[PDB]
Amino acid sequence: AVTLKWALWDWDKTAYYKPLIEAYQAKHPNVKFEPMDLGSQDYQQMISTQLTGGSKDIDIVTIKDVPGYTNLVRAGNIADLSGFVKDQKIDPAPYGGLIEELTIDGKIYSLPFRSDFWIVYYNKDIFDKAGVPYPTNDMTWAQFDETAEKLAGGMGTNKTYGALLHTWRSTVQLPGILDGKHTLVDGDYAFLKPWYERALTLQKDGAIPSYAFLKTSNTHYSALFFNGTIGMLPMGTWFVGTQIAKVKSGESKSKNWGIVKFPHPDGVPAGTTAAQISGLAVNSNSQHKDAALDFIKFVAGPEGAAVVAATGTFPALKTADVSAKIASTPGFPQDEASKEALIPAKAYLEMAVNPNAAKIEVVLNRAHDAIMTDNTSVDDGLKEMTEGVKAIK
Numbered sequence: 001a002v003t004l005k006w007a008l009w010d011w012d013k014t015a016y017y018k019p020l021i022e023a024y025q026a027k028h029p030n031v032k033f034e035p036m037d038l039g040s041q042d043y044q045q046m047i048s049t050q051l052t053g054g055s056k057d058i059d060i061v062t063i064k065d066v067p068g069y070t071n072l073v074r075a076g077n078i079a080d081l082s083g084f085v086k087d088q089k090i091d092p093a094p095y096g097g098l099i100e101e102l103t104i105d106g107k108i109y110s111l112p113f114r115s116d117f118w119i120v121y122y123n124k125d126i127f128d129k130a131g132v133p134y135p136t137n138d139m140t141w142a143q144f145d146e147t148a149e150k151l152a153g154g155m156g157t158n159k160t161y162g163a164l165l166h167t168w169r170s171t172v173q174l175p176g177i178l179d180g181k182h183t184l185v186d187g188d189y190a191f192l193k194p195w196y197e198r199a200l201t202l203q204k205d206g207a208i209p210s211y212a213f214l215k216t217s218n219t220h221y222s223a224l225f226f227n228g229t230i231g232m233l234p235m236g237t238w239f240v241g242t243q244i245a246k247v248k249s250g251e252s253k254s255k256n257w258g259i260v261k262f263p264h265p266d267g268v269p270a271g272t273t274a275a276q277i278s279g280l281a282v283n284s285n286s287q288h289k290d291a292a293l294d295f296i297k298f299v300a301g302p303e304g305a306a307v308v309a310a311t312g313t314f315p316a317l318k319t320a321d322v323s324a325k326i327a328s329t330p331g332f333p334q335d336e337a338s339k340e341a342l343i344p345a346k347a348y349l350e351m352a353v354n355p356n357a358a359k360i361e362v363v364l365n366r367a368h369d370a371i372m373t374d375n376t377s378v379d380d381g382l383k384e385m386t387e388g389v390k391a392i393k
């Protein structure tokens with residue numbers, strides 16, 4: 001008989017915690033759970049405080065994002081799982097590279113259990129009306145831009161944008177890490193030059209909404225895609241469940257839709273993408289390491305992945321079984337290509353492990369905003385990213 005205390009966030013709004021607990025307790029009825037909800041607004045601080053002074057009150061530590069992971073490892077608050085993973089023979093391949101991404105000097109301290117990655121959503125009505133065939137699961141970014149440009153046009157009610165690049169720097173920058181040659185945390189940002197050029201071209205041509213208009217109006221990407229005036233939307237997989245729900249309620253008018261794989265740069269395999277994660281970990285000072293390790297393995301593995309997926313959340317595991325559960329959700333697009341897009345070839349983290357990530361964000365966002373508003377040239381903006389990040393202390 002053990003009670004595992006599970007530090008987590010947003011208990012009432014997070015549909016998967018309860019069924020995960022009930023599914024595990026069904027097989028191990030002697031293990032019970034006290035969920036400790038520390039809130040999302042500054043979870044990182046709150047879990048840090050709760051792990052101080054060698055405290056053993058917490059067993060299972062949820063990790064919100066990569067910076068939270070990095071902080072916990074720097075503080076020494078979570079157990080190395082390397083040996084456990086190896087002994088249990090947990091196959092890393094269906095995590096798409098995330099295990100390796102989370103390995104810090106040969107050591108892994110969390111098992112990812114949810115991971116959203118980047119894809120493209122498209123509105124079939126806009127393709128049909130223009131007589132342009134639907135996007136495929138093998139598109140280069142040059143092809144994507146050609147299609148966006150063809151779809152953009154019309155007057156009045158006919159007025160359509162071929163695509164929408166949201167105001168986050170990631171919509172422009174992520175395509176630039178997909179070849180594996182650079183990350184967005186280290187060194188010289190010159191590599192981003194063609195990536196900015198293509199985005200600025202789309203904008204200057206009116207094929208996508210302008211960055212300045214999106215910033216001044218604060219228009220969320222969903223509102224325009226819901227309006228039915230956007231052909232193609234590069235966005236994370238989180239938008240799948242949202243689009244499903246809103247098409248059901250009638251708030252989204254883009255009721256004929258699909259997804260495809262993230263476009264790839266020349267010479268990169270289709271389905272190469274970027275991702276965000278949440279993970280589970282064990283308090284270094286837990287007195288119930290065995291029980292905690294078994295639970296976190298369950299959650300991150302196929303059984304937990306099925307439970308997560310049944311709530312309309314993308315688990316970290318990407319397999320045939322997870323794809324079937326996702327694509328069987330009523331409202332999920334029933335074309336073959338959409339289902340095939342659910343398992344990436346390879347996922348890079350949007351932002352690699354780096355202790356200065358939050359400070360880097362500030363430098364990159366400022367320059368991004370200057371470039372996209374035509375206030376600094378691309379070359380000058382990338383120089384500002386390179387020099388600003390170097391100067392972080």
Ligand SMILES: [Cl-]
Pocket residue numbers: 140141142143264265266
């Ligand atoms: Cl390209």
Ligand SMILES: [Cl-]
Pocket residue numbers: 064065066067275276277278
């Ligand atoms: Cl993340």
